[PDB]
């Protein structure tokens with residue numbers, strides 16, 4: 055028999071994820087069905103999104119050889135029925151206060167910083183780059199969390215040294231670039247570009263660096279269709295473009311520039327979005343989502 059979620063202490067809440075205490079040395083990482091667009095958490099959930107993103111994380115934890123925070127199987131008895139398939143049993147770690155970001159392509163705040171200064175997070179770049187330009191080798195572009203509602207602040211390597219130490223900062227940079235390079239090549243071989251990714255790490259009792267976050271989900275990473283990749287224009291979001299198109303189109307009745315919260319989504323847009331998440335998972339993993347555990 056599985057415990058109730060109310061048997062555990064709710065310890066933290068995020069935009070589309072939740073965290074619970076299991077005992078002194080273990081936590082429960084939970085993915086919800088909520089989705090974000092244009093910096094709003096939308097009213098309408100995407101069915102099975104939490105389960106699909108958890109399947110994705112478990113696949114990539116398996117593929118990568120680096121230590122990670124998993125402390126049990128996806129069907130561990132300590133996981134409540136209500137979150138089965140969208141929750142993981144993990145070990146408690148001393149977390150490092152650095153958002154460890156790798157970028158293989160120039161977009162978002164990376165592109166903006168380049169267009170303003172000619173550099174990104176202390177990396178002076180060649181002249182002549184633009185939207186969705188390839189960056190090779192990929193860049194370590196660390197950031198720090200700001201206040202509620204605000205975007206993370208981009209920082210340089212020296213800033214990271216002052217947060218975690220010189221030797222540890224070099225380790226974060228090296229492991230972030232190594233892991234991203236491997237995952238990106240794997241996805242591209244199957245027709246999906248991982249344009250960038252954001253990692254969070256912790257340290258265990260022996261001093262070892264441990265990957266401790268969801269990993270390579272379409273929330274932590276920009277997924278693009280490789281078949282339509284064209285440097286110089288904005289790329290469609292593999293998972294979120296149907297949501298974006300409806301919200302900004304003729305039928306929503308919503309003006310993005312009003313900064314008012316958006317309306318609920320059509321049921322059919324939510325179902326089409328679920329299909330897109332399933333397509334991304336099955337193409338990258340080579341597995342079938344119909345075999346992933348659930349309630």
Ligand SMILES: CCOC(=O)[C@@H](F)[C@H](O)c1ccc(Br)cn1
Pocket residue numbers: 066067068071072073149150151152153254255
């Ligand atoms: C950059 C270090 O991050 C942390 O310290 C952790 F708390 C972790 O990122 C976290 C936060 C909120 C939720 Br919900 C789940 N996990």
